[model samples]
Target: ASETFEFQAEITQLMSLIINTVYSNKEIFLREIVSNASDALDKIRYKSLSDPKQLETEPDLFIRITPKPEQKVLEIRDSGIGMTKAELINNLGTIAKSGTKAFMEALSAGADVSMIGQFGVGFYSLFLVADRVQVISKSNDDEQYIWESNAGGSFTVTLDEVNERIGRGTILRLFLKDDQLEYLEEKRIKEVIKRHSEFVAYPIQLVVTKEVE
Candidate 1:
């Protein structure tokens, strides 16, 4: 039901470099994450055009942000084409095997790679503000799975128990660093979303509890 993965030596090196050196603008981490969610939303919508059944599990498309200040956690959820376990392993576990190799190469070569998302290394940005992260996803073809990491030297993927299963899509929970708990503020999150993802097509909503509502 649970399997832990060691980051390949090369990936560990890349993660170390990313965690230590890259992405100077830490707040852009939210932008990178939301943009990734948008991509997933776009994927499912495109697929649904060809096979209408692709959306039967969850017809509504959106991105939701929930901040728990007391817990110092920020969660982002998207209704999108979720990943199977293998996909999760490939996508999150082995970044160095894919775009990250090129990304590292480009960085070493002194290429001005300001567009972090272009190289598929945007996920690494999570570590910039969060000490730990958990991704729970469900795909149309497979059962739910959770991918988790602390940006140490390893990560884990496990079968999600039915109680925590999502209908379809992905949810990312970031255990924010003590210094980054400001991200859990609703107003700050809104400002960041406005500056970075204002034009993003999908409806991005923040979950909040207020006396007025």
Candidate 2:
């Protein structure tokens, strides 16, 4: 069953700032996402140190950036610690008070904005490019779930029965806005990846499709 929830007041303001004030630095959205993926990878790796079973099936940890130009969808997939239902609700649906409140204050004061991860609201930056975003995630302890939103007033989370098995981690499908389609360009994506996430611990692979005879 699918359930929908409205955006909290704080997130509405936060997203407005992200979509309106941060246009010049829109590429940072990818950096924030990649950083989140890296964090998730770190979590699973750390967990495996004690449990060991966490890595039994999917040992490799990496991030994949796939741009489906035909569908105008840019997919960011990571082999990491995916969120359970409650975690998803907390992580994505609501803003954590401490970090996000400080972030909003700093942003509104016209201070130099730092990275999104610093404020724990990095995921909202996806709205900078995508009109609609779908997060398909599976954790070792929970069944696969899909969380989707249009950045309007509300979002939905549903148990996924149709999508392919993620095995582990999350996949974000960004339905790129028409004006933001430049993000789907190979050259642009490569440049951003190199400039921002090149130093990330895990391998960040860009899925390249080459024409074949």
Candidate 3:
């Protein structure tokens, strides 16, 4: 089943600032995403501490990147605390009054600061480069769900046809903009990863690409 929900008035204004005003350098967006992935991985690790059974599989908790130059897709997957269906809506879509209201209020006054906030809206920053972004995630407690958006008026969330039983983690699929292909370049990616994510307490595999015959 598919469902569509509109971004609230406050959230729409918030995204406008994100897509237009915030993030002077494009590479910074990748940093924000990696930081988020690190946070998720930490959450699962914290939980596994209490219930040793959670780590019975002895997962390595790594991040992997897969870039498809021909398809123009950049995928990043992390073994993390994937969210439930309701959590996905609230975290990714809604702009709760306390967190976003100030920015929305300041939108009319002018850009206040970087749009990154306490509301967990960093996911929206994907729109800075991708026309469409899809996040497929499954928590150990819930079935896998996919949330997709075009950064337009609304977004849709639906259950994935298949899912992970033991936390395959969250995979972010970014359908890149024509001009954003530079992100696929090994040099550019290495620069961004080392600059912003060097200290992240997890291993990230760059998915080094190779020439094909």
Candidate 4:
């Protein structure tokens, strides 16, 4: 079945404002993404209590970062419950599900760092640093799909035929801007994880590649 929904123009303006102005510290993007990952891990862990088999194939809930300097890409991969094609468009394209109004209310109340997690619109911050974003996701209920967008008011979603064995999780690859290369630094990524997600209840690892002799 097809569906249609409309959002108020004020909501779009608020979303633009949040993406452009609400969060001044760009580094907070790492925190927000990691926090979201942690939440996903938490969900799977809770689900595994009733369905132990779910844990058999899934990796211990964790997050990993891989930096490809040559390609100027920064990837964040997580073994978490992934979204379907519909969920991707609904979640990423509209502010209706992002709780922007409540986030704004929290900000106006002079909330602190703790309030960061309350804002579900954190994913949009990728636009601040990336010229393009690619999300590869595998869901237990659906085949893997690739979602790509340039944050230009439109996106494309397609099934991934190449990397179809990712299991159930999501991988986000950011085509970093020239000035956002700092994100590719191993030390910086480690620091970001330690600062915001040290107690995240799952392992967060950075993969460094070395040539075999």
Candidate 5:
């Protein structure tokens, strides 16, 4: 099944501004994304505490990065509590429940606003250095699906018929801009991971190869 969602009015406007206006730094992006992944991991682990049955058969309690410098793609994936179709439509469609309104108001008032909020709009930061993005996710309660956008006010979610490997969690693929290719550098990424995520409680492992022994 495939579906398209038009972003909320605030979301549409926010992306427009974020894509056009200048921002402080780009390093924080990986941090925000991983932090968000850690949150999802926490969510499921917390559930498992109450009910061991909550743990899925293929649960992977880690975040991974796959770099394709030649392809100009950087993929960040986490085995965490995935989202249902409804949750994706609701969260991605809007900037979460209330951040949209606040971000909009800040922009209108000439105050600095942010998209990196509540693990929701932090997603929009993908546009900072990427022209396009793809999100593939599998939730325990939902089948594998892909969500993609170009930060152009709309996105599409389609069923991923192939590579249904992940039983839970999300993968983010970024089509990096030319100047953003630095992000694809393995050494640079590892450095950023060490610098930005050092304090992060969750253990982040860097897997540069497809084959892990």
Candidate 6:
């Protein structure tokens, strides 16, 4: 069993800043996560050339978004290098190690924003619209884990309950805040994807089922 880790004060401050300030556009959250997924797919694809085992399952890289109107949940799932339980906290909770300050400093010095992909704070942007978030990931190297948080200075990590075969990837479900319900609409989400991630290397699809008249 692994021990739990709490967020540092600086990390808590950074989370508050992101949830309250930094990102003015909530729609950008989808784009940011999609971009991160694309990068992950790229990394796995590159690695597969040397270690063919990496391509065993879900070989085709893609992104999928499903909106559950009844539950007020928006889910984004992708085939990428999944994180372990410890990684869920260490990667998502902390901010200073992400070098966000360095990125800001470079931006302040007029560095191109396009070159800032090395920074790993993209996941934190989920708190912009989601009051609660759940991440289910299956890794080739670790046991499947589920990480859930409410962005309220605390989080919980546990083993995934669903026995459904989860391939080597991740699934993120966001319970939208009242004001963020707009993201549940298909048209709005499609527009955001087209506007920000049209050039993304992998295919992105929104699963929609039409109602019969």
- The per-prediction CA RMSD against the true structure, in angstroms, equals 2.3, 1.6, 2.8, 3.7, 3.1, 3.4
lDDT, candidate 5, residue 136? 86
Tens digits of per-residue lDDT for model 4, 23-117: 45667778877877777777777888898776665666889889999999988888888878877767766436556677667766776434555
- Any idea how many clashes model 6 has? 0
Q: What residue pairs are clashing in model 6?
A: none
lDDT of 6 by residue, 1-213 (tens): 433456656556556766665445667788788988787778778888899898787677888999998899998988887777767767766434656666556645765443344565566678778988988887777778888777777777778766355678888889998888999999999999989888988889898867998
Q: Candidate 5 lDDT, tens digit per residue, 47-80? A: 7897776676455688888887779999888888
* Runs of candidate 3 exceeding 4 Å displacement: 56-58, 95-97, 103-120, 162-166
Model 6: CA > 4 A from native: 1-4, 94-96, 101-119
The CA lDDT of each predicted structure is: 0.84, 0.85, 0.76, 0.72, 0.77, 0.76
Note the clash tally of each candidate. 0, 0, 0, 0, 0, 0
Error of 4 at 22 (Å): 7.8
- lDDT for 127 (candidate 1): 80
Q: Poorest 10 consecutive residues of model 4 by lDDT?
A: 1-10
The TM-score leader among the candidates is 2
Q: Judging by lDDT, tell me the better candidate of 1 and 6.
A: 1
Task: State the local distance difference test value for candidate 2.
Answer: 0.85
**TM-score computed on alpha carbons, candidate 4:** 0.81
Query: Which is better, 1 or 5, measured by TM-score?
Result: 1
RMSD of 1: 2.3
State the displacement of the C-alpha of residue 146, model 5, in Å, after optimal TM-score superposition. Answer: 0.5
Pick the lDDT winner. Answer: 2
Ranking by TM-score: 2, 1, 5, 3, 6, 4
